[PDB]
Amino acid sequence: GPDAASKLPLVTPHTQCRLKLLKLERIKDYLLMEEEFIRNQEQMKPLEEKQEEERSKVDDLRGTPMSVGTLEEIIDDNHAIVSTSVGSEHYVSILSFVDKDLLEPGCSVLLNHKVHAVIGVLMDDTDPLVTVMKVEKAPQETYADIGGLDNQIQEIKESVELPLTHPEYYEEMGIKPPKGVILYGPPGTGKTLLAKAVANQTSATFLRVVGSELIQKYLGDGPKLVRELFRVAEEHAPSIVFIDEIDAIGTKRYDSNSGGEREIQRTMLELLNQLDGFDSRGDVKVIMATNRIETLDPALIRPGRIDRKIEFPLPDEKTKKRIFQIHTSRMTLADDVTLDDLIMAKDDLSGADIKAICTEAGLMALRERRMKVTNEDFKKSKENVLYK
Amino acid sequence: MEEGGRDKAPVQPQQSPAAAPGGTDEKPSGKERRDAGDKDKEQELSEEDKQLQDELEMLVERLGEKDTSLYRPALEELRRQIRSSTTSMTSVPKPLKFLRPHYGKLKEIYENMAPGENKRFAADIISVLAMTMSGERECLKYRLVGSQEELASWGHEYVRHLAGEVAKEWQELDDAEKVQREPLLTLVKEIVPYNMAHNAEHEACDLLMEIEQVDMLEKDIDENAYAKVCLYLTSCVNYVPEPENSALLRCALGVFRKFSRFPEALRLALMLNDMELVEDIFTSCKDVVVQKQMAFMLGRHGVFLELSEDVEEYEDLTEIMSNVQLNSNFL
Ligand SMILES: Nc1ncnc2c1ncn2[C@@H]1O[C@H](COP(=O)(O)OP(=O)(O)OP(=O)(O)O)[C@@H](O)[C@H]1O
Ligand SMILES: [Mg+2]
C-alpha cells in the first residue's frame, strides 16, 4: 500500500538547480497555517482529542477479551458472516472502525466477545510455505567466479536480469523479454551454479523448488502446491522461480504417491497452466534446470512457456584450467603440483569433479596437519574421487 | 602542523614568505624580484589536482583570518602595484575560511575593485572557483537596499555590465547539463527590472550558437509556476520569453506563437500584427499553432477576409476547417 518514505523522489535536477528549493518552501507555509488550525479548534470544541480521546472511546466499544475468527463470507457492506472460534457461524455486523479494505474472504477478523461483531482485521502469520522457499542471499558464489561458460551466461543475464535493470531495451523495440530459460546438460556442468549466480546480483524475491517436492502423498495435494508456488511469487512483486531437477516429476517413482503416473501427469497439466494460461501473468520468470531434457513432456518446453533453451556441455580443455584456478585460488599449494598435469585425468570430467578433487585434496592435507597440498595429495585425491 | 615523507619541500621555500614582515626594511629591492619569477611557475603545479589534500593551502589559512581583517583597511591607499598583488589572495580562502554569514560586510571588499583579469582564471575551473559564492551574496544585500534606499550612486548600475559577461562563456564551457546553471543567478537580482537584464543576456548568447537555445525555454515553464503572492509579476514575467524566439533565432516560431498566450491571452496586442510578418509560413505549423488557441478565433475572419489577396484561397479554406475534416475522416 502507501509508502511511508519517498514523499517526492524528484531528483531530476540532480544539482543545485533552484527548482529543488521552490517545492520545499511550499510545504512550510501549509504547515504554519495547520499548526494554529488544529490547536485553535481543539479548545472551544473539546469533544474529540484525536490523540487520547479518539483511541479511548473505541477501546471501550471494543472488548478486553478480543476474539479471533475467520471471515467466511461478505454479505452487504456493514454486514458479514464470520465463523466463530470452533464451529459456529454468526451473522455479525461490521463496524466502521475497521479499514473495510483488508476484509478478504477468509483471512482473519477480531470480534467482540459478547455481542460478536467485526472489530478489526488481523495480519496473517507468514505461512510456513513462504519461508520454505524465500532464499535470502546466495552465500558466496559470485558471477565472475563461475568461469568457463561465457556464451551461456549472456542468455541468463539477458532473460532474467536485464529486463529488471535496463528495461529500456525491451521498452523501445516493443519486445517482451524471453519468458523463461531451461538449462540442460550432463550431470554437473554449472547448471545450478549459474542458477544461484543470478540470485546474487538480483533485486527480486528468489524462490527455489526441486522437482521432487512437486510430487506429494495424498491425491490432489499435487497440482495444489503448484498453485501455491505461483501464488507466492505473484504476491512478492518481481520474483524468479527456479525449479531444479524438473526431471523428477515422472522420472522417479515413489510409493508414497497414492496415485501413480496418472496423478503425476495432472501436476504437469497444472504446471502447464501456471506458465501460460488465460489468466494474467504479471512479472514472474521461470528458470528450469534439468539433466535429461528428453524425458519430459514436450509441452512444458513449448515456446511461450519456456523460450530460451541453454545447453551446458562438458568443460572444454581451456575452460578446465580456469576451473582449477578458481577452485584452487585460496589454497597454499606447494609449488610442486602442476595444474596442467591434472587437467587430463579422465576423458571428460564434469567440473564438479574438479571441485571434488580440490576439496578432497584439502582433507588429504588435514590428516597430516599440513597447510600445503603436494602432488601426492592430489594424486591420491584424483583416485579416491573419480574412481571409487 | 606536521609533514611526512616530503618534509624537505615545505621548509626551504617558506622562509622568504615568512620573512616578508622582516624583509620590508633595509631590503627595498629584494621583495620585488622574487615575486615576478614565482608567478610563472606557480600556475603549472596548481592546475593539476594530483593531490587530494592541499599542503600549502592550509599553512596560510590560520594567520590570514585575523591578519587580513584589520590590515586591509589599515592603509586605505590606492596603489597601482599593491592593488594587483592584494586582490590575488582574497579569493583563495573565501570558500573555506569565510563562513556562510559573512557577506553582509563584504560589500566594500569586492565592489570597490575587480580582480584584474580573473576571467581567464574562471574559465579553466568548472563550477568551484566562485560560482557558488558570487550568486549567494547578491541575493541578500541588494534586497534590503531597494526596500527604502533604492536611490543610490552610480555603483548600482556598474554591476549590470558584470552580469552580461558571465553568461557569454558558461554555456560553451562544457556543453553538458551544467548549461542550465546560468538562469538561477539572474532570477534573484532585478525582480522589478527583470526585462532589462534579460535583454542583454540573450542578445549575445543567441548569436554564439543557434540550436542550443531550445533547452533554455524548458526551464521557463516551471519557473513561472512558483510565482509571487502579489499580483505584480503576472504580466512582466510573461513578456521575457518572446524576443528570444523571434527572427533573432530559428524561424520555426512554433513555440513563439504559443508564448503570447501567457499574458492572459490579450490577443488585441500580441499577435494582431504577427500573421502577416512572414507571408510565407502558410503551409508551416503556423495554421496548426492557432488551431489550439480557441480564445480569439471568432475575430480571426474579421481581418483575414478583408485581405482577399494575401491567400490563394480565402473563402473555401475557412468553410472546411470548422468540422468538415474532423468527423468525416474518423468515421
Ligand atoms: N563450469 C563450472 N565452473 C565453476 N564451478 C563449477 C562448474 N561446474 C561445476 N562447478 C562446481 O561444481 C560444484 C558441484 O556441482 P554443481 O553445483 O556445480 O552442479 P550443477 O552443474 O548445477 O549440476 P546438477 O544440475 O547435476 O546439480 C559447484 O559447487 C560448482 O562450484
Ligand atoms: Mg543441479
Side-chain angles (χ1 to χ4, degrees), chain A residues 1-53 55-167 169-388, chain B:
Chain A
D3 296 359
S6 183
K7 320 286 291 182
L8 183 65
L10 199 290
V11 285
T12 64
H14 266 134
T15 187
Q16 309 309 301
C17 154
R18 203 64 39 250
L19 172 96
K20 237 173 63 186
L21 190 71
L22 304 321
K23 23 181 179 292
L24 296 179
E25 309 315 293
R26 180 155 315 294
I27 305 84
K28 171 183 58 60
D29 294 359
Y30 143 70
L31 263 281
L32 199 57
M33 63 57 40
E34 267 252 18
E35 258 272 17
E36 92 266 30
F37 138 79
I38 301 181
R39 37 163 185 115
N40 254 8
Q41 45 93 347
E42 216 163 6
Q43 203 275 345
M44 71 309 264
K45 267 109 176 180
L47 179 56
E48 31 183 349
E49 181 37 63
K50 182 41 55 199
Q51 298 119 44
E52 291 281 72
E53 178 68 70
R55 288 162 166 263
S56 176
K57 46 238 178 187
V58 87
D59 298 6
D60 279 21
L61 198 299
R62 284 186 165 172
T64 278
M66 227 156 299
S67 165
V68 151
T70 320
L71 169 44
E72 217 70 348
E73 169 244 304
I74 276 291
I75 182 176
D76 72 292
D77 188 315
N78 94 351
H79 271 89
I81 286 90
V82 308
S83 148
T84 167
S85 35
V86 297
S88 39
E89 303 52 37
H90 301 38
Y91 183 42
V92 278
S93 167
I94 329 166
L95 271 306
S96 314
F97 332 118
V98 306
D99 62 70
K100 298 270 155 144
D101 229 345
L102 326 187
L103 272 311
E104 180 280 340
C107 57
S108 174
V109 176
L110 277 62
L111 326 166
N112 177 355
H113 176 286
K114 279 192 306 339
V115 190
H116 310 191
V118 171
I119 291 55
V121 153
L122 192 68
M123 71 47 56
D124 166 275
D125 294 357
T126 287
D127 65 88
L129 176 61
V130 171
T131 278
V132 153
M133 57 217 161
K134 247 306 291 185
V135 290
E136 308 296 312
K137 66 301 201 184
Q140 276 291 5
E141 80 313 357
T142 89
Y143 221 158
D145 163 356
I146 166 155
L149 305 125
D150 172 14
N151 196 285
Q152 310 183 50
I153 301 208
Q154 208 189 11
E155 284 59 357
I156 289 266
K157 198 68 66 32
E158 145 170 347
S159 154
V160 313
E161 257 316 350
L162 207 43
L164 274 150
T165 85
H166 286 354
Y169 304 97
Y170 334 105
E171 271 182 331
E172 94 281 24
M173 314 216 333
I175 22 63
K176 288 342 316 173
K179 289 287 303 329
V181 315
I182 178 66
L183 309 94
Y184 68 107
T189 315
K191 297 204 279 314
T192 322
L193 177 36
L194 201 295
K196 48 185 181 179
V198 150
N200 204 13
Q201 177 100 300
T202 208
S203 35
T205 89
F206 200 94
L207 326 179
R208 206 202 29 112
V209 152
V210 184
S212 323
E213 322 113 287
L214 288 212
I215 83 174
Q216 312 264 237
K217 199 158 323 309
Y218 307 113
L219 329 168
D221 191 310
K224 155 126 64 53
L225 195 144
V226 189
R227 252 186 317 283
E228 254 58 52
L229 188 54
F230 285 90
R231 204 278 309 294
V232 152
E234 266 256 6
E235 207 210 355
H236 282 10
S239 34
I240 302 329
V241 196
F242 179 35
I243 301 177
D244 200 323
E245 303 158 25
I246 191 61
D247 80 6
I249 194 179
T251 285
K252 268 214 218 324
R253 172 169 56 290
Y254 292 86
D255 297 342
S256 295
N257 211 25
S258 325
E261 194 297 359
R262 181 158 305 92
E263 159 55 10
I264 281 270
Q265 168 85 4
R266 296 164 178 121
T267 294
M268 214 96 54
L269 300 184
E270 190 47 340
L271 184 51
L272 299 210
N273 193 261
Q274 283 312 313
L275 298 183
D276 171 336
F278 97 113
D279 263 348
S280 289
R281 191 72 255 117
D283 156 16
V284 163
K285 313 205 171 53
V286 199
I287 296 182
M288 317 183 45
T290 169
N291 34 5
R292 340 217 299 281
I293 207 75
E294 58 77 70
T295 168
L296 74 175
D297 192 343
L300 217 173
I301 318 171
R302 154 183 92 69
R305 280 186 176 78
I306 89 166
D307 212 333
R308 262 176 180 299
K309 277 173 260 320
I310 294 110
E311 166 181 7
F312 279 61
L314 284 193
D316 158 5
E317 199 298 353
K318 155 158 37 43
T319 89
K320 270 198 234 156
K321 140 179 317 181
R322 277 281 307 81
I323 303 278
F324 252 84
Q325 294 189 343
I326 169 54
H327 279 313
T328 58
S329 159
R330 283 82 73 54
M331 212 156 32
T332 65
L333 281 72
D335 49 6
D336 182 22
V337 76
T338 41
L339 299 192
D340 306 0
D341 70 55
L342 207 28
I343 222 74
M344 241 299 321
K346 288 78 154 203
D347 54 27
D348 76 16
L349 38 65
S350 60
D353 278 344
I354 290 322
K355 189 268 202 43
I357 273 148
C358 302
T359 175
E360 193 32 21
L363 272 310
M364 198 69 36
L366 220 75
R367 193 65 65 71
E368 315 328 345
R369 289 293 137 149
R370 164 179 50 250
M371 25 52 60
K372 271 197 323 269
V373 316
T374 89
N375 233 48
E376 195 44 300
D377 320 280
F378 268 130
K379 197 191 78 39
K380 56 176 39 53
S381 212
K382 64 84 177 299
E383 56 82 13
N384 219 355
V385 174
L386 290 66
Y387 143 82
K388 214 180 50 184
Chain B
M1 79 293 259
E2 64 96 21
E3 81 303 359
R6 75 311 303 273
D7 309 28
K8 76 305 181 191
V11 173
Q12 172 192 357
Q14 198 258 136
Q15 166 196 9
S16 292
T24 180
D25 47 343
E26 296 102 14
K27 270 165 58 191
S29 172
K31 64 175 188 293
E32 310 265 5
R33 290 318 82 229
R34 164 200 59 81
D35 264 328
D38 196 57
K39 187 174 307 180
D40 173 72
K41 61 211 303 175
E42 209 90 7
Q43 286 160 359
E44 190 259 329
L45 203 57
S46 307
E47 289 160 346
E48 48 86 9
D49 214 357
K50 79 187 185 73
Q51 296 174 224
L52 268 305
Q53 34 91 28
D54 298 322
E55 197 170 350
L56 270 189
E57 266 71 2
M58 161 147 144
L59 259 300
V60 166
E61 184 58 305
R62 152 59 251 171
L63 58 99
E65 48 215 85
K66 268 81 182 176
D67 223 321
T68 48
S69 299
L70 59 97
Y71 196 86
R72 201 86 173 244
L75 49 98
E76 272 295 321
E77 163 101 326
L78 268 302
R79 171 70 169 95
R80 309 92 84 179
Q81 176 275 318
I82 201 67
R83 86 91 203 169
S84 288
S85 296
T86 303
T87 181
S88 66
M89 56 72 214
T90 304
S91 172
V92 165
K94 274 180 327 185
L96 273 78
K97 190 69 222 143
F98 281 92
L99 183 47
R100 278 320 202 203
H102 200 276
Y103 258 91
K105 56 178 80 72
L106 224 56
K107 47 179 84 67
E108 174 263 14
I109 190 190
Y110 187 76
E111 200 71 23
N112 283 126
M113 74 64 228
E117 213 261 326
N118 61 336
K119 317 314 312 173
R120 82 184 95 159
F121 298 93
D124 62 358
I125 198 51
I126 179 46
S127 163
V128 304
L129 198 137
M131 303 82 174
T132 305
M133 47 234 65
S134 294
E136 288 186 352
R137 70 147 313 150
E138 281 147 5
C139 298
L140 289 165
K141 48 91 197 153
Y142 190 86
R143 326 314 162 195
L144 72 83
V145 165
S147 183
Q148 79 270 52
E149 41 168 357
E150 63 268 9
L151 295 171
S153 67
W154 71 272
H156 148 265
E157 40 275 47
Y158 142 75
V159 66
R160 318 315 322 119
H161 184 275
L162 194 45
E165 184 184 6
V166 155
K168 295 179 289 190
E169 197 264 327
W170 182 228
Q171 305 319 271
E172 63 97 21
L173 200 147
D174 278 324
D175 283 341
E177 226 70 41
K178 51 198 73 174
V179 178
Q180 291 71 305
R181 277 263 177 172
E182 57 164 356
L184 293 193
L185 192 140
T186 62
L187 321 181
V188 191
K189 208 262 179 181
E190 277 178 87
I191 310 110
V192 164
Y194 178 56
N195 300 102
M196 155 285 167
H198 194 275
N199 271 330
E201 319 145 357
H202 85 268
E203 188 261 341
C205 82
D206 62 348
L207 199 76
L208 201 137
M209 86 282 195
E210 267 301 273
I211 182 57
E212 274 191 332
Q213 278 88 64
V214 187
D215 158 45
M216 311 337 174
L217 296 185
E218 287 189 3
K219 309 158 273 282
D220 280 349
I221 281 158
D222 51 337
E223 270 166 294
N224 55 66
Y226 305 115
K228 285 73 37 189
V229 177
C230 175
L231 295 191
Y232 80 110
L233 265 202
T234 48
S235 35
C236 153
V237 80
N238 284 323
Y239 165 90
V240 51
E242 285 143 6
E244 300 81 61
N245 284 268
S246 34
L248 306 180
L249 211 62
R250 37 103 160 169
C251 294
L253 309 164
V255 284
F256 200 0
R257 302 170 202 107
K258 183 185 80 169
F259 297 157
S260 43
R261 182 170 155 180
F262 320 149
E264 198 86 331
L266 67 160
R267 256 61 185 155
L268 90 177
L270 319 165
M271 66 321 302
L272 256 180
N273 48 351
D274 218 356
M275 302 54 272
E276 76 280 350
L277 291 183
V278 180
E279 291 151 23
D280 296 304
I281 43 164
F282 154 85
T283 326
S284 75
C285 85
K286 172 91 167 184
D287 275 347
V288 78
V289 166
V290 50
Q291 201 170 202
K292 178 54 214 65
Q293 260 157 351
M294 299 45 265
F296 196 67
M297 193 263 184
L298 68 158
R300 291 268 64 73
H301 216 42
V303 196
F304 211 86
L305 202 288
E306 69 104 11
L307 327 168
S308 314
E309 67 246 9
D310 76 299
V311 285
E312 46 263 40
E313 48 180 3
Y314 88 121
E315 47 99 14
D316 35 40
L317 185 133
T318 51
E319 256 291 354
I320 330 302
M321 86 61 55
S322 162
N323 280 318
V324 183
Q325 288 207 355
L326 199 138
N327 309 339
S328 53
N329 282 321
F330 150 73
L331 290 156

